[PDB]
Amino acid sequence: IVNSHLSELDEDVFHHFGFTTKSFDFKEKFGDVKFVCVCGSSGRIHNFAISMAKLAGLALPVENIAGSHARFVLYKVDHILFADHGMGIPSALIMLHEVTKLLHYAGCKDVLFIRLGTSGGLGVKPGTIVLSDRCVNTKLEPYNELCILGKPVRRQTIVDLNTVNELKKLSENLSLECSVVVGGTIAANDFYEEQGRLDGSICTFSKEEKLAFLQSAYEHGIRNMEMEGTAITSHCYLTGHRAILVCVTAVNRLEGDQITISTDEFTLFAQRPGQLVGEYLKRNNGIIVR
Amino acid sequence: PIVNSHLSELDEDVFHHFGFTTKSFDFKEKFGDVKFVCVCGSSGRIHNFAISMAKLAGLALPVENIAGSHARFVLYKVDHILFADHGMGIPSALIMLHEVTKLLHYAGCKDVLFIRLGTSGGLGVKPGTIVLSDRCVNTKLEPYNELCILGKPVRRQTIVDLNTVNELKKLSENLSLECSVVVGGTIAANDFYEEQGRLDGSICTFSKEEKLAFLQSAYEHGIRNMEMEGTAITSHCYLTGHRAILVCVTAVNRLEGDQITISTDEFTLFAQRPGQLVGEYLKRNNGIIVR
Numbered sequence: 021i022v023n024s025h026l027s028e029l030d031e032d033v034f035h036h037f038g039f040t041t042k043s044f045d046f047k048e049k050f051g052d053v054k055f056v057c058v059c060g061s062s063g064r065i066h067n068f069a070i071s072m073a074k075l076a077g078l079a080l081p082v083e084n085i086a087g088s089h090a091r092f093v094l095y096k097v098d099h100i101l102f103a104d105h106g107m108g109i110p111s112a113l114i115m116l117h118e119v120t121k122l123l124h125y126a127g128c129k130d131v132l133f134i135r136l137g138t139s140g141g142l143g144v145k146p147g148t149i150v151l152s153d154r155c156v157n158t159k160l161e162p163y164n165e166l167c168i169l170g171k172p173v174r175r176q177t178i179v180d181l182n183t184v185n186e187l188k189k190l191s192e193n194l195s196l197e198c199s200v201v202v203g204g205t206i207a208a209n210d211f212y213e214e215q216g217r218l219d220g221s222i223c224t225f226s227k228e229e230k231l232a233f234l235q236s237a238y239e240h241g242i243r244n245m246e247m248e249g250t251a252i253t254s255h256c257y258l259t260g261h262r263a264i265l266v267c268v269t270a271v272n273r274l275e276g277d278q279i280t281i282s283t284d285e286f287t288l289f290a291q292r293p294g295q296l297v298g299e300y301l302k303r304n305n306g307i308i309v310r
Numbered sequence: 311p312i313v314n315s316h317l318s319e320l321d322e323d324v325f326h327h328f329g330f331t332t333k334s335f336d337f338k339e340k341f342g343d344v345k346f347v348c349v350c351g352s353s354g355r356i357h358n359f360a361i362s363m364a365k366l367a368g369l370a371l372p373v374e375n376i377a378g379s380h381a382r383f384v385l386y387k388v389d390h391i392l393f394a395d396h397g398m399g400i401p402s403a404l405i406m407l408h409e410v411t412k413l414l415h416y417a418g419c420k421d422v423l424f425i426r427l428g429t430s431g432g433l434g435v436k437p438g439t440i441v442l443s444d445r446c447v448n449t450k451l452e453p454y455n456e457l458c459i460l461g462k463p464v465r466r467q468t469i470v471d472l473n474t475v476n477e478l479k480k481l482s483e484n485l486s487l488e489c490s491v492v493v494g495g496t497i498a499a500n501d502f503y504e505e506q507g508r509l510d511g512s513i514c515t516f517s518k519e520e521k522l523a524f525l526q527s528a529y530e531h532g533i534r535n536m537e538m539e540g541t542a543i544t545s546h547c548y549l550t551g552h553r554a555i556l557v558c559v560t561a562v563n564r565l566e567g568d569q570i571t572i573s574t575d576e577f578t579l580f581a582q583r584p585g586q587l588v589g590e591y592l593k594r595n596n597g598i599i600v601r
């Protein structure tokens with residue numbers, strides 16, 4: 021399924037990455053991509069790309085392919101692209117539209133998107149990696165909702181469960197310093213109110229109403245909460261690709277709302293999804309091991 | 311009025327996305343004089359605007375980031391003005407709004423004006439035009455921000471500070487800008503492509519005829535530009551006791567096309583136009599002390 025309007029453009033400008041289809045030979049430059057790793061932080065995804073380059077035995081600079089005034093960054097290491105997506109579904113959708121167009125022009129088929137994020141845990145210890153087995157909205161429905169030309173639309177979320185299972189198996193054969201849990205993930209459209217936090221600038225609910233909401237989620241198999249999953253796992257399916265979420269937790273929301281861990285520990289925890297996924301990528305031809 | 315009663319339960323409040331806490335500073339002394347908060351989606355752009363304001367104010371030393379080095383957002387202060395970025399989209403803007411309005415509360419600030427200095431798609435105006443929003447609406451043309459809280463739909467009305475908008479239009483007639491300034495309505499959308507009626511995304515479920523009927527309808531309802539944050543900014547500030555305006559430049563006329571074809575340099579130049587107008591407004595309305 022290709023957007024029939026694209027070929028009618030003489031040049032396609034990737035506004036948020038600061039380049040166009042005339043900037044590179046897309047087939048030659050990107051044609052070998054089979055994985056796209058993304059997260060909300062430019063610095064974090066940059067450091068992950070560097071880590072993958074070192075695992076690949078690459079001794080050459082990991083250069084940002086995006087323009088200097090672009091909203092997003094983009095790196096390539098062997099068969100993996102790395103991009104940030106900011107925070108929230110709308111921002112993620114911008115990256116998704118532009119990256120999936122890039123893959124199309126490059127002739128890349130059936131690529132795996134991997135979101136390496138952070139999240140609020142539900143009933144798990146901070147620092148736990150959650151492999152999402154479903155991505156749902158705040159009503160626990162496996163759909164991303166959109167309003168297109170002012171009309172409501174919904175798109176089903178589909179996680180690549182085969183890959184989730186491979187990652188769980190891998191974690192069982194590695195010596196990790198954290199637990200790896202497979203469970204459901206809520207995507208919310210704010211950090212505070214929609215996530216049931218009492219510590220925002222506005223709160224219209226009681227602690228009892230909050231607990232009921234979070235306990236219900238937990239009983240329905242939810243183990244973490246973040247802000248992008250329903251976009252990533254609905255969009256990729258519809259453009260012919262696969263997606264997974266691999267997110268660490270930074271707080272147990274059944275215990276509190278504030279992120280009280282140190283900045284150093286948060287950064288450490290945030291690198292854990294990459295620890296697991298990096299080994300997976302090394303074993304599954306994401307990088308060439310030199 | 312109206313403060314979140316739960317905040318008094320905290321001995322320390324951690325502003326996660328700014329990388330500091332209520333114990334990092336004496337908030338009343340540090341931020342108590344703030345009367346303006348200027349925001350946009352780009353950290354680089356808002357930093358550069360803060361630098362320009364510091365220069366207008368006669369300040370020599372560089373403008374330093376107040377946010378932690380590993381924070382999601384940046385934060386600057388020049389005299390009575392705070393400057394922050396907000397990323398792209400309502401959810402990202404709401405994170406900024408919650409943390410900044412909490413900051414203002416702890417600092418004892420009242421009736422602050424938030425000014426979003428953004429970029430946008432124009433509807434029937436030339437690229438490079440500054441649009442002063444006189445209302446912010448969703449993609450259904452309703453002046454409400456929609457939320458889903460504990461899984462239940464909530465709607466919050468949007469309110470623009472029209473008196474200030476009128477003051478800015480009047481100011482623009484007294485300045486020598488490279489552009490025109492238009493007052494009109496602004497749609498906030500939850501994506502850049504499909505929700506904005508663009509034909510050039512990775513997915514498109516509609517025709518050009520359908521795109522134009524949508525945008526024509528919007529234009530007929532007084533809409534002159536389209537962006538991704540306005541309904542959050544203008545509903546949240548009202549509820550927390552503050553005021554808000556949007557001052558956005560256009561980078562394309564969406565009635566003619568979707569692609570941003572102007573050069574990257576010219577886009578950056580256009581994006582400085584809201585600050586050109588707003589900076590002079592701040593100079594004239596005690597945002598800075600002129601030394």
Ligand SMILES: Cc1cn([C@H]2C[C@H](O)[C@@H](CO)O2)c(=O)[nH]c1=O
Pocket residue numbers: 060106107108137138139140141211215245246247248269270271279
């Ligand atoms: C710790 C945490 C992270 N996140 C994720 C998703 C966002 O992209 C970003 C917001 O802090 O990090 C949450 O949504 N909720 C949380 O409680």
Ligand SMILES: Cc1cn([C@H]2C[C@H](O)[C@@H](CO)O2)c(=O)[nH]c1=O
Pocket residue numbers: 351397398399428429430431432502506536537538539560561562570
């Ligand atoms: C030019 C343009 C900018 N924007 C704004 C709002 C977002 O914060 C960011 C997205 O590019 O810039 C639009 O939403 N639509 C547009 O057509």
